[PDB]
Every structure is written in C-alpha cells, then in structure tokens.
Curated annotation (Swiss-Prot), chains B, C:
Entry function: Major capsid protein that self-associates to form hexamers, building most of the capsid in association with pentons made of the capsid vertex protein and one dodecamer of the portal protein. The major capsid protein self-associates to form 160 hexamers, building most of the T=13 laevo capsid. Folding of major capsid protein requires the assistance of two chaperones, the host chaperone groL acting with the phage encoded gp23-specific chaperone, gp31. The capsid also contains two nonessential outer capsid proteins, Hoc and Soc, which decorate the capsid surface.
Subunit structure: Homohexamer. Interacts with the portal protein. Interacts with the capsid vertex protein that forms pentamers. Interacts with hoc; one hoc molecule associates with each capsid hexamer. Interacts with soc; this interaction reinforces the capsid structure. A total of 960 subunits of the major capsid protein forms the 160 hexamers.
Gene responsible for this protein: gp23
UniProt record similarity statement: Belongs to the Tevenvirinae major capsid protein family.
Name the record gives this protein: Major capsid protein
UniProt organism field: Enterobacteria phage T4 (Bacteriophage T4)
Record PTM: A proteolytic cleavage by the prohead core protein protease gives rise to the mature major capsid protein during virus maturation.
Length: 430, 52, 52
C-alpha cells in the first residue's frame, strides 16, 4: 500500500426517461391499437375515399350541399376559367377548396407537379381571381331526391367510417460480462470491489442508456422538419435558424432583443404541430446544450429586451437532463449527445395513447448468472424486451393505410420525417 | 464533415434497433445454430504515480 | 511584448515546481546546513526623515 491515492471512474449520465412519449406497460408481447376514421363517399374503404375530419385539410364545404347535385370542374394546369363558375381543387395541404372565378384566366400552363399547380392557384387566390365559396343545394332539387316524381340519379350523399388497425412486436437486447475469478479477487484486494456487482451495474446501465437514446433518435428520425412550409420565412435558409443572418431575427442586434427570435420560432413550430395532430400545442422541447444555454440566459417572458447569465433553467447534463419548463409551457430536456446543434419540439397528451411515439416495455433487465465448468469462470448478464411504435395517423398526409392493417412499428416508409407530433430545427450561429 | 452534410440533407438518419427474438432466442449456438455470440462488456483498471 | 506574444501563442508557458525526491533523499539526512545549499531570505530596513 504505497500511499494509495484513492481511485476514479466515470459518472453515469442521466436519462429523459419516457417523459415525452407513451409508456404502454405491457403484460404480453405484440399488442395492438385500432382507430376509427370518419369517411364519406359510400365506401369507407376505397381508393379515393374521403375522411370527414383531418387537421390539415378543409372539409368538403359542398358535400351535403350543391355538390350533391353537380360536379364542379376541376382546376388544372393550362385551363381557362369562366367568370362566375366554380372550380374545385384538392390542395396538397389545406385540402378541399371550391373557388369561384372572378375572372376568365388561365392557370400556369407550364405547371407540372401538383405543387406547382397549387402554388399558382394560391397566387390566383391572393390576386382575387379565385375566391373560396360554398352553398347548399337548390331546394327544388332536394325535393325529389331518391327518385321522387319520376326523377332519377338523385341519391343523397352518404357517410360512414372505416375501422382499421396496426400492431407491434417486441425486439430485445442482451449483454454479458464474461469476467474472471482472478480479476475479481485482485479487485477485492485493491479497492474492495465485488467485481460482479460493478459489472452488473455497467451492463444494466448500458442497456437502459441505449434504450433511452434509441427513443430520442426515433424522435429525431420521425420528426418533420420545421422552418418549412407553413412555418417558413421565404427569405430563410430552409430548416435552419441562425443568429448571424438577420432574416431569422428580424434585423436584430443586441442579444437582449435578438435571442428572443428563437423563442418566436419555437412557438410557431409548436403551433404547427397542433395543426398537424389535432390535439394541442407542443408541450416539450429537447435541445442541444448550446440552445438551452441561450434559453436560460434570455428572459423568455414578454418584455422590452433582456439578457443575463444562463440561470433560467438547469443547464447541466450531470445532475439531470431536464432543464425546466419554458415559459411555464414546454418541458425542456437537453440532448446531451446532440450531433451538431439543434432542437426538436413536440406534443404529448395526458392520454398515454396520444403521443406519436410509444414505448411499450414487456420484459426488462432480467439478470442471468452461471459459470462455465471448463474453467469455472463466471458468466453474468441481463436481458430486456419491449418494442416501440407510432401513432396511427402520425404521417397525417394520408387519410388511411393500405389493406386496413399495418405494422405500428416505425420504418422508413412508415415514418421517416413524417410524424405529425414533432418538428426538427437546425441551429447555427450561437 | 461530409457525413454531417448528408445528415443535414436527411440522406443519412440516426438509427438504433433491437434484436429479433428469432435471433436472440438461439444466440450462442443454441439448438444447433452457430456463429452467433453475444456482445460483452467489462472494464480495465490502471494506475499512475506522482513524484513528491 | 514579444515574450507575451509567445505566451499567448502557447509557445512559452509559465510554470514552476519543486526540486526533486532524488534530492530530498540526501537533504533529509543533512538535515540543515549542507553542500547542496538552500536558498535563503530575510529582510533589510529603511527610514526617512522630515524637517519642521
């Protein structure tokens, strides 16, 4: 014992648990969730079937109304309108819209993709060429619906719904220590270590860390990219928020007024999420430690301007990972392993099935012990099994899935960059 | 740097995934299977000294 | 000024330390005055006068 100076080891980082996702404790593997989709057009399950309700699409304002009697001409690239008539178009976003023509004009003959057509139509709308319109059906038509008085081809529009579902499956993970007797004995003689228990700790720890890290990555993987579309400033850099570029800060200088610009965008992204999910404004953010340092140093309340030290929210990743609540509104977590600099926002409801992302544990941290008689060295390890999944409707773009059944597990096709509950923001310039 | 550019592009996306039971169930040559060991963790111990 | 530039540059770093245990081994058996002399210090004095 030549003046032993004690010893060191690394600390274990904390986790965000499942604070921002579903937890679905399971008592069996492979559970299932189903859903009802209000639908109309006399066949709940069909190509082209239309959903009665959707966060991103307007309703068919003339479905029970005049559209019952007549079809409306569709808008299409290169066609010319007739003043006073009404044209129909289903937009990629904002859905069914009926537009009365105030003028006789053409629409972007050079348009190709629907996105280009939608853009010109939007311009014609702004221009006052095309105006939103709806009306009920002339009563003289309604009078004979269902073939009265010798009439024909006059059914009422019908509605119903389609129930379908998705299922999940649990994947697992296991690790062993495979250690030796002699090492454990020496450790007992050096620090008084058990050298099995420490390993048990390490293995269990690693498993838990991986799972939690996996959830965060799935959040990032499925989240839509923000500062885009409906939340985009047209002169911006598309998905990334800077401090070195006046476009994102409305010309700000003077950090006391500049930093608030981010808070503004955060609200916009949180609101759009509600627009995407139909449930509510995002209520949680996870972000790089650099982002949080900024948040904690700016007065996030409404005031003239203000700057100081980063004391507003815990900023460490050594005690916790939970920084605090932003404005008293969003739960702020720190992405202690962020690859660059950024921040994801999202919404999780009181209903465990209302989360977008779900974790559903079935088996966890089962210890295993024994020894191999060939050399009698010990073997120890741990096993976990759970499975994760995604919300039906998380994509939101589609009103319904193929074949009335799908995996509820994430995949590229199922959710990469699609999840209505979360949005990504890249951050630079801090 | 180039990898990160592709990540920003959305070309490359962070991922993690578990093992199927169909694999884990027979890991380490169980039931006639082979070439399928578990991953393992341990530790190392070391020491340093200071001239007084 | 030039030294400072080199210090800021990291070329020159301020540092100081003790002598050695390879030295202390002998100093201990001295254990005061010796042929491997110690640095020594004290104080001087000063005074000033005034006139009315």
């Amino acid at each position: 014992g030549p003046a032993v100076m004690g010893m060191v080891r690394r600390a274990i980082p904390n986790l965000i648990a499942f604070d921002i996702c579903g937890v679905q404790p399971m008592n069996s593997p492979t559970g299932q969730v189903f859903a009802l989709r209000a639908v109309y057009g006399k066949d709940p399950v069909a190509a082209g079937a239309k959903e009665a309700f959707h966060p991103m699409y307007g309703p068919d304002a003339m479905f029970s109304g005049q559209g019952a009697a007549k079809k409306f001409p569709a808008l299409a690239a290169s066609t010319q309108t007739t003043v006073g008539d009404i044209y129909t178009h289903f937009f990629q976003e904002t859905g069914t819209v009926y537009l009365q023509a105030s003028v006789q004009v053409t629409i972007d003959a050079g348009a190709t993709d629907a996105a280009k057509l939608d853009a010109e139509i939007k311009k014609q709308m702004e221009a006052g060429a095309l105006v939103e319109i709806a009306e009920g059906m002339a009563t003289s038509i309604a009078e004979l619906q269902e073939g009265f008085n010798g009439s024909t081809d006059n059914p009422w529009n019908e509605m119903g719904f389609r129930i379908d579902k998705q299922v999940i499956e649990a994947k697992s993970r296991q690790l062993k220590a495979a250690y030796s007797i002699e090492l454990a004995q020496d450790l007992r003689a050096v620090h008084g270590m058990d050298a099995d228990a420490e390993l048990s700790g390490i293995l269990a720890t690693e498993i838990m860390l991986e799972i939690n890290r996996e959830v965060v990555d799935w959040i990032n993987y499925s989240a839509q990219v923000g500062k885009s579309g409906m939340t985009l400033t047209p002169g911006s850099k598309a998905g990334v928020f800077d401090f070195q570029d006046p476009i994102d800060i409305r010309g700000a200088r003077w950090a006391g007024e500049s930093f608030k610009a981010l808070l503004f965008q955060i609200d916009k992204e949180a609101v759009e999420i509600a627009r995407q999910t139909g449930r509510g404004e995002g209520n949680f953010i996870i972000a790089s430690r650099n982002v949080v340092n900024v948040l904690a140093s700016v007065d996030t309340g409404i005031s003239y301007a203000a700057q100081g030290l980063a004391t507003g929210f815990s900023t460490d990743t050594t005690k916790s990972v939970f920084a605090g609540v932003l404005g008293g509104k969003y739960r702020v977590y720190i992405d202690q392993y962020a690859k660059q600099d950024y921040f994801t926002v999202g919404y999780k409801g009181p209903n465990e099935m209302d989360a977008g992302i779900y974790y559903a544990p079935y088996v966890a941290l089962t210890p295993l012990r024994g020894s191999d008689p060939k050399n009698f060295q010990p073997v120890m390890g741990f096993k976990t099994r759970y499975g994760i999944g995604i919300n039906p409707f998380a994509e939101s773009a589609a009103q319904a899935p193929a074949s009335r059944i799908q995996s509820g597990m994430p995949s590229i096709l199922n959710s990469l960059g699609k999840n209505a509950y979360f949005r990504r923001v890249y951050v630079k310039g801090i």
